Coordinates of C-alpha atoms and ligand atoms in Angstrom, one line a residue:
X1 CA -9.7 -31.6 -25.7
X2 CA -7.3 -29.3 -28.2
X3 CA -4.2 -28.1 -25.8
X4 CA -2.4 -28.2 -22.5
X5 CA -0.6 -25.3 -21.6
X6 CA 2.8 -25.9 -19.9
X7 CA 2.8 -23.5 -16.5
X8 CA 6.0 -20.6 -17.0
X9 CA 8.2 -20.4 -13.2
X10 CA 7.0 -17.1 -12.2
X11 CA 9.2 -14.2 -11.3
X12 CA 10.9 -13.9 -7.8
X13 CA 9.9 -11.2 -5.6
X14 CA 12.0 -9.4 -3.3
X15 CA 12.6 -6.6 -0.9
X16 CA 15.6 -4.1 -2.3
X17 CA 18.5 -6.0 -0.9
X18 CA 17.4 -9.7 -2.1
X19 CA 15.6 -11.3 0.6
X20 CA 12.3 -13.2 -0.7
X21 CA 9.0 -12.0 -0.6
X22 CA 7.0 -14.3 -3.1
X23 CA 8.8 -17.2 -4.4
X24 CA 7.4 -19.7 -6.9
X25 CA 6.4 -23.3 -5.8
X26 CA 6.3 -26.3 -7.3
X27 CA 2.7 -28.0 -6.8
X28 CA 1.1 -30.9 -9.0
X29 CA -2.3 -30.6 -11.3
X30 CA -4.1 -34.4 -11.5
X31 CA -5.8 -34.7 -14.9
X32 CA -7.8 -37.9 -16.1
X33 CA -9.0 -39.2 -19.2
X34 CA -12.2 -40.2 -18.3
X35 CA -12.3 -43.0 -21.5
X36 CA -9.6 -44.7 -19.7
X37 CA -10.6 -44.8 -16.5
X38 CA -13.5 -46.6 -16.8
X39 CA -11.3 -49.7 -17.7
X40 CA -10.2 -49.5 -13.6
X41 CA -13.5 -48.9 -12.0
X42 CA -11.8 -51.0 -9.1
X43 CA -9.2 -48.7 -8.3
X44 CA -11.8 -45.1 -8.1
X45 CA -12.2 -45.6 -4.4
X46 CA -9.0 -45.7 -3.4
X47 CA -8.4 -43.0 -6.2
X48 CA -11.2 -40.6 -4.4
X49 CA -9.8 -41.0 -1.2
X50 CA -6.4 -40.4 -2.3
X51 CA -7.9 -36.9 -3.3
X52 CA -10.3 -36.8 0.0
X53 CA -13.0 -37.0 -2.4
X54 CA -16.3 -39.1 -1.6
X55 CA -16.4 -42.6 -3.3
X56 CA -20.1 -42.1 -4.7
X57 CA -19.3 -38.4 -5.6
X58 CA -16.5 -39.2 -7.5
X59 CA -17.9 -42.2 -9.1
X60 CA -20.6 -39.9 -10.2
X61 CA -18.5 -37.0 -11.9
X62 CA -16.3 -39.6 -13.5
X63 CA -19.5 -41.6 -15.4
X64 CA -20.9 -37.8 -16.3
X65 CA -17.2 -37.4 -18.0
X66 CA -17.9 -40.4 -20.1
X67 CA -17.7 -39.0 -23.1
X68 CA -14.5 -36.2 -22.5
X69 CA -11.8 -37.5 -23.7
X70 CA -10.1 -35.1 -20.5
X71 CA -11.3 -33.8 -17.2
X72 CA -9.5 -32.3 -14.2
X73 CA -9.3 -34.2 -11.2
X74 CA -8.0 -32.1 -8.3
X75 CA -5.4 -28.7 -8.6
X76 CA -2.4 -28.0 -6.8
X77 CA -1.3 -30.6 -4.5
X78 CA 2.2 -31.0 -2.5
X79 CA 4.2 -32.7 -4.6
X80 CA 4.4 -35.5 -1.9
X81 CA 0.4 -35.9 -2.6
X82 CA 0.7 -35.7 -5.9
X83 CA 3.3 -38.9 -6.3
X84 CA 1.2 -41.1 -3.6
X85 CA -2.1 -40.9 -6.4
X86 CA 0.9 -41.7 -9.1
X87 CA 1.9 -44.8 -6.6
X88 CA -2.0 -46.4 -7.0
X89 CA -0.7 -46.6 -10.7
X90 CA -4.0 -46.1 -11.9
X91 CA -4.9 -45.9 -15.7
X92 CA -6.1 -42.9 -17.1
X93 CA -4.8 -40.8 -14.9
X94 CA -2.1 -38.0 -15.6
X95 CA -0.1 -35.1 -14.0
X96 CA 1.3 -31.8 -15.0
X97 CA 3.7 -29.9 -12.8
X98 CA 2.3 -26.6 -12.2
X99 CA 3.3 -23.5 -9.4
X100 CA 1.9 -21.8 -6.8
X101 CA 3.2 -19.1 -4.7
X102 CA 4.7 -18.7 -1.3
X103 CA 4.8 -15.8 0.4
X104 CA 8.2 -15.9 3.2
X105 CA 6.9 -12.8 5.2
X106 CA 3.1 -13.5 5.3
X107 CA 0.9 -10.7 6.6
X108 CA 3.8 -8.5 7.0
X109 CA 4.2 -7.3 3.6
X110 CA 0.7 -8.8 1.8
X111 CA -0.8 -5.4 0.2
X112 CA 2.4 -4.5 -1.5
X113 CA 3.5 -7.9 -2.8
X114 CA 0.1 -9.0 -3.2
X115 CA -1.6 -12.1 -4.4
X116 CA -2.2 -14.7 -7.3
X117 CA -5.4 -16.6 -8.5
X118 CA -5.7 -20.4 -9.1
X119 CA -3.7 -20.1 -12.7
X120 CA -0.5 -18.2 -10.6
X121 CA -1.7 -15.0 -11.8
X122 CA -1.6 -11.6 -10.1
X123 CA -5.1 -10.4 -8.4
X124 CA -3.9 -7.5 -5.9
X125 CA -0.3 -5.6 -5.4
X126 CA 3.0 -6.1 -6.9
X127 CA 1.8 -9.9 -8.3
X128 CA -1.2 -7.9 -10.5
X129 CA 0.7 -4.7 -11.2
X130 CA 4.4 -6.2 -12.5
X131 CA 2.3 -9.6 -13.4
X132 CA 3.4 -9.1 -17.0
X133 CA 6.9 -8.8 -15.9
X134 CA 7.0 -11.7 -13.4
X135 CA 4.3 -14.4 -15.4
X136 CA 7.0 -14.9 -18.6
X137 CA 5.5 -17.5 -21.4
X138 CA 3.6 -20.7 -20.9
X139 CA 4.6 -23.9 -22.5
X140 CA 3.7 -25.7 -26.1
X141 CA 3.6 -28.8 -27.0
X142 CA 1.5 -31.1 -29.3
X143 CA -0.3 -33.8 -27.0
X144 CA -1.0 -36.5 -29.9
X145 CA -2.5 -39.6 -29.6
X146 CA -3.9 -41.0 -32.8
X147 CA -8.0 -41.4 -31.8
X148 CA -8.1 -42.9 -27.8
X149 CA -6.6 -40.6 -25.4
X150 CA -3.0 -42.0 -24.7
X151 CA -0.3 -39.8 -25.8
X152 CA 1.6 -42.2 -28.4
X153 CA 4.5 -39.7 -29.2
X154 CA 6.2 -36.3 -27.7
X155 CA 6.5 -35.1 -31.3
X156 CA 7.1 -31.0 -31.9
X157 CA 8.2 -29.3 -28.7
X158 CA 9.0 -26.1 -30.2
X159 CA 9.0 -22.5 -28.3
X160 CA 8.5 -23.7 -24.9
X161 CA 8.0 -22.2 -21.3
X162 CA 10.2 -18.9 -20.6
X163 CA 10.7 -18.1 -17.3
X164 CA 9.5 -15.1 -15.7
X165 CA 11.9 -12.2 -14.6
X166 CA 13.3 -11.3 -11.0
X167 CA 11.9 -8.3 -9.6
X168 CA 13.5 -6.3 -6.5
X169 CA 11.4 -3.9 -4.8
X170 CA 11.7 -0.4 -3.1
X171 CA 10.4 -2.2 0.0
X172 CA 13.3 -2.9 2.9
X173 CA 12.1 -5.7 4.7
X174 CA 13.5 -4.6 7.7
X175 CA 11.7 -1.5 7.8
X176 CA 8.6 -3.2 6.8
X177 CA 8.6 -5.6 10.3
X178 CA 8.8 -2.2 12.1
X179 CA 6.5 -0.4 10.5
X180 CA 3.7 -3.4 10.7
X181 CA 5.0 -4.1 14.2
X182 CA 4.5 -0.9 15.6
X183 CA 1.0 0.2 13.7
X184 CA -0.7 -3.3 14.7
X185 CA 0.3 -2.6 18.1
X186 CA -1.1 1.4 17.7
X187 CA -4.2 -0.3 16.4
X188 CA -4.3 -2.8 19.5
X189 CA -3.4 0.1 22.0
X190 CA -6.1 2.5 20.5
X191 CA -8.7 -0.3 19.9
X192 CA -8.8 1.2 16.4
X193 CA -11.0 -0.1 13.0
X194 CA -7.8 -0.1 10.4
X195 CA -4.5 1.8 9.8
X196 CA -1.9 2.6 7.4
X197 CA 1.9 3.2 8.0
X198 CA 3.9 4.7 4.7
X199 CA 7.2 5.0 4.7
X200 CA 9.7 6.9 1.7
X201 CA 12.9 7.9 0.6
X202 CA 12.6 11.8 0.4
X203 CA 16.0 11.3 -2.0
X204 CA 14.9 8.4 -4.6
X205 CA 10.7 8.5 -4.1
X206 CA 11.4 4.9 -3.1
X207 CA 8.2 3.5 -0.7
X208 CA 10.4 1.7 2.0
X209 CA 7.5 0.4 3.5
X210 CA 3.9 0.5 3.2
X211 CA 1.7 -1.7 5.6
X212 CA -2.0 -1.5 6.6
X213 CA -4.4 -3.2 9.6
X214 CA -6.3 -5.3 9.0
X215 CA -3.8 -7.6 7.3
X216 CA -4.1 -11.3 5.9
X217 CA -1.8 -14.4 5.6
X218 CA -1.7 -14.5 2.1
X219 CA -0.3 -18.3 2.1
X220 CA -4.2 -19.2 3.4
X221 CA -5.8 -19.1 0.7
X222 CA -9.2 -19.8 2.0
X223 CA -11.5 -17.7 4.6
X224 CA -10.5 -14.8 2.8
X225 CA -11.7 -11.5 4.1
X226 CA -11.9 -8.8 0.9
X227 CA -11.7 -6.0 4.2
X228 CA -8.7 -7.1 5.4
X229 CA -7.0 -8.1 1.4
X230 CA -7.6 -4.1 0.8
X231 CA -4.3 -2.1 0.6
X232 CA -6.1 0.9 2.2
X233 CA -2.6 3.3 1.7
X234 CA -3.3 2.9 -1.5
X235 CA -6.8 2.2 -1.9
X236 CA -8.7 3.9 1.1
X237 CA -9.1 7.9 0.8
X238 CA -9.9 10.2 3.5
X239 CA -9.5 14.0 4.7
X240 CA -6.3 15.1 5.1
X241 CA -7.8 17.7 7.5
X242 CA -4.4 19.9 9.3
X243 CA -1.4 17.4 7.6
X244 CA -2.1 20.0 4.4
X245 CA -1.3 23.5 6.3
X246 CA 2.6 22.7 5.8
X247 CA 1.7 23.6 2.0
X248 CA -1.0 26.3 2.5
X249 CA 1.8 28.0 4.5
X250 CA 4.5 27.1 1.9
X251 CA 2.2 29.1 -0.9
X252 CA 2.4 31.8 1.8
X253 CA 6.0 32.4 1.7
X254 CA 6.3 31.9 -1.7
X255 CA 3.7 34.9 -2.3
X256 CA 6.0 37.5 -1.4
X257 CA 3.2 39.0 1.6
X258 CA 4.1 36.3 4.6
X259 CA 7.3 36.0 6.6
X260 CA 7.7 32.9 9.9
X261 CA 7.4 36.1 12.1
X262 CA 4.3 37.9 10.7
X263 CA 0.9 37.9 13.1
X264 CA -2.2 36.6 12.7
X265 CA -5.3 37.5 15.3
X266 CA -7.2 34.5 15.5
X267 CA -9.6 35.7 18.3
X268 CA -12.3 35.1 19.5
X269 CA -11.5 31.0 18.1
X270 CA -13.9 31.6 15.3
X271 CA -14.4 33.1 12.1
X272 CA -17.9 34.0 10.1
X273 CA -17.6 32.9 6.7
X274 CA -21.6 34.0 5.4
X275 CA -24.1 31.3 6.7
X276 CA -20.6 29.0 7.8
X277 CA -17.9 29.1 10.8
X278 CA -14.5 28.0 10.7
X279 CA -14.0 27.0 14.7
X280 CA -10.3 26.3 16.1
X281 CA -10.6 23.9 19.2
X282 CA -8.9 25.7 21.7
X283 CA -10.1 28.9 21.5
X284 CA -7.4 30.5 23.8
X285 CA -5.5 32.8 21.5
X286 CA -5.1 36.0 20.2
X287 CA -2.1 37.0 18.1
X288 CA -0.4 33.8 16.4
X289 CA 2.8 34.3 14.6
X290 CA 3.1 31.3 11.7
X291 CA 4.9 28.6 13.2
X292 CA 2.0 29.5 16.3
X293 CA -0.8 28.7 13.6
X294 CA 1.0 25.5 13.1
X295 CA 1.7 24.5 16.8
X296 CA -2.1 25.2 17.7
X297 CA -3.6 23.9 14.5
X298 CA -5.5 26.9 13.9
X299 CA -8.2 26.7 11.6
X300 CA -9.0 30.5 11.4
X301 CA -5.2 31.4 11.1
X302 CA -4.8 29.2 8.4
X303 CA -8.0 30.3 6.5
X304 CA -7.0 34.0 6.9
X305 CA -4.1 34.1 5.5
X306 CA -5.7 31.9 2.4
X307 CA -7.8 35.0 1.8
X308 CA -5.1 37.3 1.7
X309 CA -3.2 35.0 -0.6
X310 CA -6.0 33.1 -2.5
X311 CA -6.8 29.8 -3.4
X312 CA -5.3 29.4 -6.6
X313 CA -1.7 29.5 -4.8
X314 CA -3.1 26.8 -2.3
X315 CA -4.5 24.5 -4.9
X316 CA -1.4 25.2 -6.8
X317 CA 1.3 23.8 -4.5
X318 CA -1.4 21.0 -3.5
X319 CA -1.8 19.9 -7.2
X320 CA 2.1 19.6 -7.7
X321 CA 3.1 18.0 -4.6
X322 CA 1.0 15.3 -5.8
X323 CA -2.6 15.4 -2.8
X324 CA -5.7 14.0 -5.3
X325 CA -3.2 13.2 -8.1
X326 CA -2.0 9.8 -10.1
X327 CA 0.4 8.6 -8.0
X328 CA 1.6 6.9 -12.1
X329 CA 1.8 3.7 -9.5
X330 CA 0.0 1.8 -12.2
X331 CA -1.7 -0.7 -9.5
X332 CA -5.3 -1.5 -10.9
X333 CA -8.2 -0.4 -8.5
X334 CA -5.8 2.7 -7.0
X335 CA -7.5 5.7 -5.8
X336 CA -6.4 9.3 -7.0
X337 CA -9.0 11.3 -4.6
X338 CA -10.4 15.0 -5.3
X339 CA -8.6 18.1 -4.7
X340 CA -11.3 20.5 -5.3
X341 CA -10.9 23.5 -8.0
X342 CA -12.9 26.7 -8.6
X343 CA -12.4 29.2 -11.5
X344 CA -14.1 31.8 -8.9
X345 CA -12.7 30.4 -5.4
X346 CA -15.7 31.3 -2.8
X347 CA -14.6 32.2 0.2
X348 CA -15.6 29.2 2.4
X349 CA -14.2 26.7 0.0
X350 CA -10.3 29.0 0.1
X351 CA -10.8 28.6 3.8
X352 CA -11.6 24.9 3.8
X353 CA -9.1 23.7 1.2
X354 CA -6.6 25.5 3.3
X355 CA -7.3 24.2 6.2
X356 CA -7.8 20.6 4.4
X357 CA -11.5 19.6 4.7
X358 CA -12.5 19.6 1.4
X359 CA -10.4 16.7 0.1
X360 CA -9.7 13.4 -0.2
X361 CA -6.3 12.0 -1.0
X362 CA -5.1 8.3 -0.1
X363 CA -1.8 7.7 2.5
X364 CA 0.8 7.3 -0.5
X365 CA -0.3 10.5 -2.0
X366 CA -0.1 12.8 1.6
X367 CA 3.8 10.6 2.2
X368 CA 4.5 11.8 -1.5
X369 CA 3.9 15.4 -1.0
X370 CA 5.5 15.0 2.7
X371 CA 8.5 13.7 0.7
X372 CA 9.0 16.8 -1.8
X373 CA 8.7 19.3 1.2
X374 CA 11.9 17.1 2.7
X375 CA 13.6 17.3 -0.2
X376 CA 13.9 21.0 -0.3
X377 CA 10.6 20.9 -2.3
X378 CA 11.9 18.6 -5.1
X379 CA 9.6 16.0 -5.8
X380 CA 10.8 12.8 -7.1
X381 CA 8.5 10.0 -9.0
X382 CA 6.9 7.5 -6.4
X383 CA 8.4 4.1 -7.0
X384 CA 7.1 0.4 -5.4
X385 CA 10.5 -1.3 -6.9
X386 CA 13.9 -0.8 -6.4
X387 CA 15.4 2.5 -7.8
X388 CA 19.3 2.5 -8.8
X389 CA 19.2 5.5 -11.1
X390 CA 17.1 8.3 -9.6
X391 CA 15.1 10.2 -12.3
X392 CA 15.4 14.3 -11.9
X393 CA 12.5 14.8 -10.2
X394 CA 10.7 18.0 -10.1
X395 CA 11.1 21.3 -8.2
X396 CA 8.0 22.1 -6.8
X397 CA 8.5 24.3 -3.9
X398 CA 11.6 26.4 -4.2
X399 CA 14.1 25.2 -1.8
X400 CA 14.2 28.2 0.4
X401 CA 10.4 28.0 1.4
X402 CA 10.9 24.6 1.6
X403 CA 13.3 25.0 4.2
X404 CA 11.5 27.3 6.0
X405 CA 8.6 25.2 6.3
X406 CA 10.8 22.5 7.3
X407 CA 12.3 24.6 10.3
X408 CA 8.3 25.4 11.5
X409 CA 7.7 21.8 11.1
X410 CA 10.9 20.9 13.2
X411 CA 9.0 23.8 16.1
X412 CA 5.5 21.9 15.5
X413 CA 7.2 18.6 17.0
X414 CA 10.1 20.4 19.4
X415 CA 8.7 23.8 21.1
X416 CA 6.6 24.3 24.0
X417 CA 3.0 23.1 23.4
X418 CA 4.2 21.4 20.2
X419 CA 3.5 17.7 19.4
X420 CA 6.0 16.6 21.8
X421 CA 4.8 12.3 21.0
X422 CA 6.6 13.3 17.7
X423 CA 9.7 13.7 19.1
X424 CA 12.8 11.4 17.9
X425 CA 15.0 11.0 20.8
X426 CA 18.6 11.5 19.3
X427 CA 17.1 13.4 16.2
X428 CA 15.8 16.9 15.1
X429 CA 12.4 15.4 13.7
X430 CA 9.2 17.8 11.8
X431 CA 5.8 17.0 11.3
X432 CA 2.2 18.1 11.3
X433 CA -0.8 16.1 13.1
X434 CA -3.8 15.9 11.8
X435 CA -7.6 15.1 13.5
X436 CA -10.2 14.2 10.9
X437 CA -14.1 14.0 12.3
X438 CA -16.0 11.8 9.9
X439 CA -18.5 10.3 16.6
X440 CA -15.8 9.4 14.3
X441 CA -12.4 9.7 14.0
X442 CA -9.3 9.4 11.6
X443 CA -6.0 10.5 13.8
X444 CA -2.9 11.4 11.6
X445 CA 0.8 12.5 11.7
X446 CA 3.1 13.0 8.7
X447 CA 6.4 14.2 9.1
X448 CA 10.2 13.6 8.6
X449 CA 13.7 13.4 9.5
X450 CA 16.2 14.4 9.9
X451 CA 15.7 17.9 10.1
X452 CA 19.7 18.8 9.0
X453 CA 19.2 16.0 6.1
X454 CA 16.0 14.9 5.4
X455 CA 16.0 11.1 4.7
X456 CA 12.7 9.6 5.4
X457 CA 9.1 10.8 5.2
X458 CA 6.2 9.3 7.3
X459 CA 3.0 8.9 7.1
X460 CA 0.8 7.2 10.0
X461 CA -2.9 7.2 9.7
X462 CA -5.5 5.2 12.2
X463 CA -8.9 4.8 11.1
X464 CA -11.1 5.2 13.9
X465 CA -9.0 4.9 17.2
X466 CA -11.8 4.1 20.5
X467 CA -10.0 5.3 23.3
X468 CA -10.4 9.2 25.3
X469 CA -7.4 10.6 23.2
X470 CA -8.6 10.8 19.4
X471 CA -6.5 13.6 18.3
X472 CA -3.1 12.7 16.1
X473 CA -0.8 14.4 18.3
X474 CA -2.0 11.6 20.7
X475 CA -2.9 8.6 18.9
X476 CA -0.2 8.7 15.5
X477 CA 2.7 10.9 17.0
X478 CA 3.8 8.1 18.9
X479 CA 3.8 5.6 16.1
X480 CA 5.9 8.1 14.0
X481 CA 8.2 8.0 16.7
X482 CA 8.3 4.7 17.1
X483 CA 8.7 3.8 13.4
X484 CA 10.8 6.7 12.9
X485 CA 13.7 6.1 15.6
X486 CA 13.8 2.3 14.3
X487 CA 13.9 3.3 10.3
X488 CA 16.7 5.9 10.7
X489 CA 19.0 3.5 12.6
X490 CA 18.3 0.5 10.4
X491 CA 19.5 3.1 7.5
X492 CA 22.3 3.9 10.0
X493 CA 21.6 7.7 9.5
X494 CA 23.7 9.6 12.0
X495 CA 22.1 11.0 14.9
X496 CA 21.5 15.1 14.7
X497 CA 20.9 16.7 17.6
X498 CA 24.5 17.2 18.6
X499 CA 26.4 20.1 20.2
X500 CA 26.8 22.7 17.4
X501 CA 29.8 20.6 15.6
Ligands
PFV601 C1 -6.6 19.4 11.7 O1 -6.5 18.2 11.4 C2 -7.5 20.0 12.7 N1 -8.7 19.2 12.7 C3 -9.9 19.8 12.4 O2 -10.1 21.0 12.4 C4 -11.0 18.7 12.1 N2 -11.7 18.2 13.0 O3 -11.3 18.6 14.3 C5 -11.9 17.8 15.4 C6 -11.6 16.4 15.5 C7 -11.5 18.5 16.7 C8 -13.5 18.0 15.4 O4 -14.0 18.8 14.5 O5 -14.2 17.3 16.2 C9 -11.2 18.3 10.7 C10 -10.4 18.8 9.6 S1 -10.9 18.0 8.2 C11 -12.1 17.1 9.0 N3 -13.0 16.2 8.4 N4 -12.1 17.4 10.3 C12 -6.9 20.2 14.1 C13 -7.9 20.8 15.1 N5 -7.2 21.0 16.4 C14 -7.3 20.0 17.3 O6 -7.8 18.9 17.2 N6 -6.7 20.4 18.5 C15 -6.0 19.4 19.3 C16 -6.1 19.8 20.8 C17 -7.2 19.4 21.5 C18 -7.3 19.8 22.9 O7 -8.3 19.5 23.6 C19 -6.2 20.6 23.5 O8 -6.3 21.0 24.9 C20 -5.1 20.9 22.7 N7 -5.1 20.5 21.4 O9 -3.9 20.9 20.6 N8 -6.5 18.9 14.5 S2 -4.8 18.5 14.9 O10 -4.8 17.2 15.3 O11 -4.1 18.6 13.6 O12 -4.4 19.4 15.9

């Protein structure tokens, strides 16, 4: 037939300080021209063995070629496989050096680098979204013969293969075999369906790591389970539920009518919204300052002062933080969610989008938002590769009720009846839980640290855990901690909570 193209090297993969991640693999294509072949007959059986083929089948698909003048025989064998059906020295039979990848870290960091087809091309992650960037140009050159098959001259070999280019993500390795560590564990410990663990630099928007359960070995390229090839932090939405208070609250103090220290009366646990109830789980309060509405997740607290301040200043921070936005990732298949709007907000829906059951937003886009409330409300554009010059970035909160929010945040995690499993030993940490009922459950946490410097924001998510303890404060809190305490020391951030220096 017309043309054989020349396979490109594609592009090396790596974490941000250089260590591989998918690296490209020599592997060897047999091709036959059937015409030729049928002057060895003798030699097909050892040929078809040589390939593990069967010596009938073979025979068969080589007599139905008759006419081609070429046919492939097998794709992608070792190079040691390939030279051992070059050593039977039988006619007709050719071989192109082609590539295949090799993924160093496996499982660990699959979803984000991804995976290639059978032609080295990019089908999930990185490998599909940069594949432009990392496939380069394949080779030309004129295969003539004259009229038989045998290539008689190597004449014009003009613009051939260019090399595809290097590309160094935001991902730290290091942080990534903590991360997916510590949330497979979470998974084990809680008997749980999936999770997702996304970590980011507050300062640069940079994803450090990113790693979901169920996860894959994406060197075995057969069995291959589509459930456990999804990158659910990016792919997967759900109910953000409580995590989305922090900027209900933050649209609070920026409305001029709410201070930390004003009251709300959240008795008798419930509130009737016409034919609807918003219900707080423990129904044991009265008078709940802020930071209390916070620290007791309360439903009716929350949705109260959303009346007084009204939706719009809700959806408003929501929207610009990023929750049931393009992410402008660029990954094919990415999910941007729903953050419900209203020209006329009802009050039920003010109350539920404050509270955050209305909405679905994917574990990148709640770490995202988590990320421009740690840095004093500046949100920075979400990158998967390595970022050297940090764009300007957007002020979304202003940094005062950023700051504020952060210091409630820091009490959610630290004062009495808080979310305690949060805690950092060594560091001031902040956060928010979150519960989700879909009986079943999605348990989160989302926080940061430190609380003097923000540096990192978390997100930990598990999709339905199967044990007594559902709740986030329970089943992600400790991951966060976990995950957290690791990160900041592999940064070598210095530990805050020290005596007033
Ligand atoms: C925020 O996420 C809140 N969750 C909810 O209100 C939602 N469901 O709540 C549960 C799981 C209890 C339910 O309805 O069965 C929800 C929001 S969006 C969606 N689809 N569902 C808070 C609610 N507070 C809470 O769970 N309290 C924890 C708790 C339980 C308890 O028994 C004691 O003694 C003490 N505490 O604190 N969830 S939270 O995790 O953010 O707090």
């Amino acid at each position: 037939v017309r043309h054989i193209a020349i396979p490109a090297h594609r592009g090396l993969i790596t974490d941000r300080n250089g260590e591989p991640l998918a690296v490209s693999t020599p592997v060897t294509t047999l091709w036959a021209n059937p015409k030729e072949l049928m002057t060895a007959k003798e030699r097909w059986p050892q040929l078809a063995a040589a390939l593990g083929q069967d010596t009938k089948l073979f025979a068969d698909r080589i007599e139905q070629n008759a006419e081609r003048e070429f046919i492939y025989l097998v794709r992608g064998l070792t190079p040691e496989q390939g030279e051992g059906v070059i050593a039977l020295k039988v006619p007709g039979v050719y071989s192109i050096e082609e590539f295949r990848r090799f993924y160093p870290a496996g499982e660990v960091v699959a979803h984000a680098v991804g995976f290639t087809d059978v032609d080295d091309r990019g089908r999930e992650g990185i490998e599909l979204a940069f594949d432009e960037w990392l496939a380069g140009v394949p080779g030309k050159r004129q295969v003539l013969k004259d009229r038989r098959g045998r290539v008689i001259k190597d004449v014009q070999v003009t613009k051939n293969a260019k090399p595809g280019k290097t590309l160094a993500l935001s991902i730290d390795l290091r942080l990534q075999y903590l991360a997916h560590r510590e949330l497979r564990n979470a998974l084990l410990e809680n008997g749980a369906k999936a999770g997702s663990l996304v970590i980011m630099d507050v300062k640069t928007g940079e994803i450090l790591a990113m790693t979901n359960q169920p996860t894959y070995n994406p060197n075995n390229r057969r069995n291959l389970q589509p459930a456990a090839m999804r990158n659910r932090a990016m792919i997967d939405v759900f109910e953000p539920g409580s995590t989305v208070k922090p900027f209900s609250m933050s649209a609070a103090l920026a409305s001029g009518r709410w201070k930390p220290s004003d009251i709300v009366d959240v008795y008798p646990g419930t509130l009737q919204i016409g034919r609807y109830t918003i219900r707080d789980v423990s129904r044991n309060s009265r008078q709940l300052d802020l930071t209390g509405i916070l620290i007791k997740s309360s439903n009716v607290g929350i949705s109260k002062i959303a009346f007084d301040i009204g939706a719009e200043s809700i959806y408003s921070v929501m929207q610009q933080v990023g929750l049931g936005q393009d992410t402008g990732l660029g990954f094919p298949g990415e999910r941007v969610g729903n953050l419900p709007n209203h020209r006329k907000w009802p009050k039920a829906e003010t109350a539920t989008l404050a509270y955050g059951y209305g909405l679905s937003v994917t574990a990148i886009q709640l770490a995202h938002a988590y990320a421009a409330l740690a840095n004093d409300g500046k949100s920075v554009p979400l990158s998967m590769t390595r970022v050297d010059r940090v764009p300007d970035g957007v002020q979304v909160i202003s940094p005062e009720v950023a700051s504020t929010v952060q210091g409630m945040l820091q009490q959610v995690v630290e004062a009495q009846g808080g979310v305690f499993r949060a805690q950092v030993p060594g560091y001031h940490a902040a956060g928010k839980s979150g519960t989700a009922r879909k009986n079943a459950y999605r348990s989160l946490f989302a926080g940061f640290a430190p609380a003097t410097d923000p540096r990192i924001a978390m997100v930990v998510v598990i999709d339905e855990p199967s044990k007594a303890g559902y709740f986030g404060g329970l089943v992600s809190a400790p991951v966060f901690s976990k995950v957290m305490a690791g990160a900041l020391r592999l940064m070598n951030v210095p530990p805050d909570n020290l005596p007033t220096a």
